[PDB]
Scaffold this active site. Structure first.
Site, PDB file in Angstrom:
ATOM      1  N   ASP A   1      28.529   2.545  35.405  1.00  0.00           N
ATOM      2  CA  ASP A   1      28.437   1.101  35.708  1.00  0.00           C
ATOM      3  C   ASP A   1      27.264   0.501  34.957  1.00  0.00           C
ATOM      4  O   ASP A   1      26.136   0.978  35.085  1.00  0.00           O
ATOM      5  CB  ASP A   1      28.211   0.880  37.209  1.00  0.00           C
ATOM      6  CG  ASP A   1      28.176  -0.584  37.573  1.00  0.00           C
ATOM      7  OD1 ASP A   1      29.266  -1.134  37.843  1.00  0.00           O
ATOM      8  OD2 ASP A   1      27.055  -1.190  37.569  1.00  0.00           O
TER       9      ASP A   1
ATOM     10  N   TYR B   1      21.256  -5.832  31.922  1.00  0.00           N
ATOM     11  CA  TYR B   1      20.382  -4.662  32.126  1.00  0.00           C
ATOM     12  C   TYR B   1      19.666  -4.284  30.827  1.00  0.00           C
ATOM     13  O   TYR B   1      18.664  -3.550  30.842  1.00  0.00           O
ATOM     14  CB  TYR B   1      21.177  -3.444  32.603  1.00  0.00           C
ATOM     15  CG  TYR B   1      21.908  -3.609  33.917  1.00  0.00           C
ATOM     16  CD1 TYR B   1      21.694  -4.713  34.751  1.00  0.00           C
ATOM     17  CD2 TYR B   1      22.828  -2.643  34.329  1.00  0.00           C
ATOM     18  CE1 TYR B   1      22.393  -4.842  35.962  1.00  0.00           C
ATOM     19  CE2 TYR B   1      23.516  -2.759  35.521  1.00  0.00           C
ATOM     20  CZ  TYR B   1      23.297  -3.855  36.319  1.00  0.00           C
ATOM     21  OH  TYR B   1      24.008  -4.002  37.455  1.00  0.00           O
TER      22      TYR B   1
ATOM     23  N   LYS C   1      29.505  -6.261  32.975  1.00  0.00           N
ATOM     24  CA  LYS C   1      29.485  -7.545  33.667  1.00  0.00           C
ATOM     25  C   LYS C   1      29.025  -8.635  32.746  1.00  0.00           C
ATOM     26  O   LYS C   1      28.159  -8.406  31.879  1.00  0.00           O
ATOM     27  CB  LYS C   1      28.532  -7.499  34.867  1.00  0.00           C
ATOM     28  CG  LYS C   1      28.549  -6.163  35.628  1.00  0.00           C
ATOM     29  CD  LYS C   1      27.655  -6.203  36.867  1.00  0.00           C
ATOM     30  CE  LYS C   1      27.722  -4.863  37.679  1.00  0.00           C
ATOM     31  NZ  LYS C   1      26.946  -3.740  37.054  1.00  0.00           N
TER      32      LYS C   1
ATOM     33  N   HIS D   1      29.045 -11.213  36.997  1.00  0.00           N
ATOM     34  CA  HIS D   1      27.844 -10.577  37.557  1.00  0.00           C
ATOM     35  C   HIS D   1      27.336 -11.343  38.777  1.00  0.00           C
ATOM     36  O   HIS D   1      27.014 -10.745  39.793  1.00  0.00           O
ATOM     37  CB  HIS D   1      26.771 -10.498  36.459  1.00  0.00           C
ATOM     38  CG  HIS D   1      25.715  -9.469  36.703  1.00  0.00           C
ATOM     39  ND1 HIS D   1      25.053  -8.844  35.665  1.00  0.00           N
ATOM     40  CD2 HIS D   1      25.186  -8.970  37.846  1.00  0.00           C
ATOM     41  CE1 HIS D   1      24.164  -8.003  36.161  1.00  0.00           C
ATOM     42  NE2 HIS D   1      24.225  -8.060  37.482  1.00  0.00           N
TER      43      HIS D   1
HETATM   44  N1  LIG Z   1      26.222  -6.309  40.561  1.00  0.00           N
HETATM   45  C1  LIG Z   1      24.929  -6.434  40.853  1.00  0.00           C
HETATM   46  O1  LIG Z   1      24.352  -7.525  41.066  1.00  0.00           O
HETATM   47  C2  LIG Z   1      24.158  -5.170  40.981  1.00  0.00           C
HETATM   48  C3  LIG Z   1      24.682  -3.940  40.555  1.00  0.00           C
HETATM   49  N2  LIG Z   1      23.932  -2.770  40.712  1.00  0.00           N
HETATM   50  C4  LIG Z   1      24.544  -1.475  40.213  1.00  0.00           C
HETATM   51  O2  LIG Z   1      24.368  -0.480  41.230  1.00  0.00           O
HETATM   52  C5  LIG Z   1      23.631   0.626  40.697  1.00  0.00           C
HETATM   53  C6  LIG Z   1      22.887   1.344  41.786  1.00  0.00           C
HETATM   54  O3  LIG Z   1      21.973   0.456  42.440  1.00  0.00           O
HETATM   55  P1  LIG Z   1      20.406   0.536  42.217  1.00  0.00           P
HETATM   56  O4  LIG Z   1      19.830  -0.686  42.856  1.00  0.00           O
HETATM   57  O5  LIG Z   1      20.078   0.861  40.817  1.00  0.00           O
HETATM   58  O6  LIG Z   1      19.858   1.709  43.103  1.00  0.00           O
HETATM   59  P2  LIG Z   1      20.277   2.928  44.042  1.00  0.00           P
HETATM   60  O7  LIG Z   1      20.592   2.475  45.451  1.00  0.00           O
HETATM   61  O8  LIG Z   1      21.220   3.819  43.331  1.00  0.00           O
HETATM   62  O9  LIG Z   1      18.773   3.501  44.152  1.00  0.00           O
HETATM   63  C7  LIG Z   1      18.083   3.904  42.926  1.00  0.00           C
HETATM   64  C8  LIG Z   1      16.677   4.339  43.301  1.00  0.00           C
HETATM   65  O10 LIG Z   1      16.791   5.576  44.041  1.00  0.00           O
HETATM   66  C9  LIG Z   1      16.131   6.659  43.372  1.00  0.00           C
HETATM   67  N3  LIG Z   1      17.024   7.767  43.614  1.00  0.00           N
HETATM   68  C10 LIG Z   1      18.215   8.069  42.944  1.00  0.00           C
HETATM   69  N4  LIG Z   1      18.812   9.136  43.431  1.00  0.00           N
HETATM   70  C11 LIG Z   1      17.998   9.541  44.453  1.00  0.00           C
HETATM   71  C12 LIG Z   1      18.082  10.621  45.395  1.00  0.00           C
HETATM   72  N5  LIG Z   1      19.108  11.497  45.420  1.00  0.00           N
HETATM   73  N6  LIG Z   1      17.062  10.729  46.300  1.00  0.00           N
HETATM   74  C13 LIG Z   1      16.029   9.861  46.308  1.00  0.00           C
HETATM   75  N7  LIG Z   1      15.853   8.796  45.471  1.00  0.00           N
HETATM   76  C14 LIG Z   1      16.885   8.703  44.568  1.00  0.00           C
HETATM   77  C15 LIG Z   1      16.001   6.188  41.953  1.00  0.00           C
HETATM   78  O11 LIG Z   1      14.893   6.737  41.277  1.00  0.00           O
HETATM   79  P3  LIG Z   1      15.083   7.668  39.976  1.00  0.00           P
HETATM   80  O12 LIG Z   1      15.858   6.944  38.915  1.00  0.00           O
HETATM   81  O13 LIG Z   1      13.623   7.931  39.642  1.00  0.00           O
HETATM   82  O14 LIG Z   1      15.807   8.909  40.445  1.00  0.00           O
HETATM   83  C16 LIG Z   1      15.805   4.697  42.116  1.00  0.00           C
HETATM   84  O15 LIG Z   1      14.455   4.358  42.483  1.00  0.00           O
HETATM   85  C17 LIG Z   1      22.794  -0.016  39.588  1.00  0.00           C
HETATM   86  O16 LIG Z   1      22.130   0.896  38.735  1.00  0.00           O
HETATM   87  C18 LIG Z   1      23.830  -0.931  38.939  1.00  0.00           C
HETATM   88  O17 LIG Z   1      24.617  -0.126  38.054  1.00  0.00           O
HETATM   89  C19 LIG Z   1      22.643  -2.818  41.310  1.00  0.00           C
HETATM   90  C20 LIG Z   1      22.105  -4.033  41.732  1.00  0.00           C
HETATM   91  C21 LIG Z   1      22.854  -5.226  41.569  1.00  0.00           C
END
Ligand SMILES: NC(=O)C1=CN([C@@H]2O[C@H](COP(=O)(O)OP(=O)(O)OC[C@H]3O[C@@H](n4cnc5c(N)ncnc54)[C@H](OP(=O)(O)O)[C@@H]3O)[C@@H](O)[C@H]2O)C=CC1
Length: 308
Positions: free
Chosen positions: A43, A48, A76, A109
């Site tokens: 995704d 981004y 998006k 988006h």
């Molecule tokens: N349409 C929209 O408006 C939006 C879409 N999205 C989409 O959704 C995706 C996911 O949401 P997002 O907000 O990025 O975050 P997530 O809910 O996936 O959380 C990501 C955070 O969690 C940490 N993390 C990842 N895996 C673990 C784990 N197993 N245990 C503990 N911490 C963990 C990451 O750090 P690290 O990388 O250091 O592991 C990072 O800080 C986005 O990347 C995007 O593709 C997100 C927001 C808005």
């Protein structure tokens, strides 16, 4: 189920790799996720600023033997391009960066148009009217021309969804919304289910800002199941019936995040997670669309049509 079937008949893998704020290891992460961890869904989004790197990762995964038809890529279209004449150019730019001939899913988006050069937070005059019907018609033309397999929306409300459904010739295939314990958004989920629209949960771990991996309630469940808190948060989404797109820039977590098949969260624990009060919203859209002095949106409630 490890996949969902959209209205168009196209299959979408239940778990995908999020790439928002993926950083310099973006390409590496994408290739590792697909080859080593078995992910078949990525995704991303033009805003981004990582699509060129995601393209390199997808290319490397295809060069490694993964066939394009088996991969599901979502992107998006950003607010500044939400004008009829700007839809096609925005999508072609995205395909160029991703190094693809088509994408599987292309989402609105946010349902708000922004003036070019708009700032965060927006200045007077920078948040424009979204011609939902006219923009959606050009999104449909992307499908007609085989550049996109399915189209969808993110960050919608029920009122906006009903408006879209009265006009759309091709209904949104997927509605992607922030969802996790503490922000279920059952209201939008029920409206989507009512119309057969698949839902994808973004920020399933509560993103970084409201990350839930260290939440005592989630920890308690994880310890009893001998699973990591992240695995419990991702499995919770699958159990609710939504696809889910956890993001990590760490290979270990990318692998960890997809080990969510072959076990379940017991009902009593699933209910405890569902009981966490809905108030933990990470993305309100206030820094993107709210200008309380001049409008048009003066609060987060205005952005969400006073539905939550
Ligand atoms: N349409 C929209 O408006 C939006 C879409 N999205 C989409 O959704 C995706 C996911 O949401 P997002 O907000 O990025 O975050 P997530 O809910 O996936 O959380 C990501 C955070 O969690 C940490 N993390 C990842 N895996 C673990 C784990 N197993 N245990 C503990 N911490 C963990 C990451 O750090 P690290 O990388 O250091 O592991 C990072 O800080 C986005 O990347 C995007 O593709 C997100 C927001 C808005």
């Amino acid at each position: 189920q490890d996949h969902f079937v959209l209205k168009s008949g196209h299959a979408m893998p239940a778990v995908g790799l999020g790439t928002w704020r993926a950083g310099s290891d973006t390409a590496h992460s994408v290739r590792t996720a697909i080859t080593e961890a078995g992910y078949r869904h990525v995704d991303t989004a033009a805003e981004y600023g990582v699509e060129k790197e995601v393209g390199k990762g997808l290319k490397a995964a295809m060069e490694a033997g993964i066939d394009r038809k088996d991969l599901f890529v979502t992107s998006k279209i950003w607010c500044t391009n939400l004008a009829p004449e700007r839809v096609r150019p925005a999508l072609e730019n995205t395909l160029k960066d991703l190094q693809l001939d088509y994408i599987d899913l292309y989402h609105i988006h946010w349902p708000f148009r922004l003036k070019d050069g708009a700032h965060m937070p927006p200045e007077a005059g920078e948040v424009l009217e979204f011609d939902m019907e006219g923009v959606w018609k050009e999104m449909e033309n992307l499908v007609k021309d085989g550049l996109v397999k399915d189209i969808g929306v993110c960050n919608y409300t029920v009122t906006k969804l009903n408006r879209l459904l009265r006009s759309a010739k091709i209904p949104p295939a997927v509605c992607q919304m922030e969802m996790h314990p503490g922000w279920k958004n059952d209201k939008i989920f029920e409206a989507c289910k009512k119309h057969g629209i698949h839902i994808t949960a973004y920020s399933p771990l509560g993103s970084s800002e409201k990350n839930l991996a260290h939440d005592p309630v989630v920890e308690k469940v994880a310890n009893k199941l001998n699973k990591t808190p992240g695995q419990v948060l991702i499995k919770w989404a699958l159990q609710r019936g939504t696809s889910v797109i956890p993001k990590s820039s760490k290979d270990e977590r990318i692998k960890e995040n997809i080990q969510v098949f072959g076990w379940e969260i017991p009902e009593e624990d699933f209910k405890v997670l569902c009981s966490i009060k809905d108030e933990k919203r990470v993305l309100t859209g206030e820094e993107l669309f709210v200008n309380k002095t001049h409008g048009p949106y003066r609060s987060a409630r205005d952005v969400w049509d006073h539905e939550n």
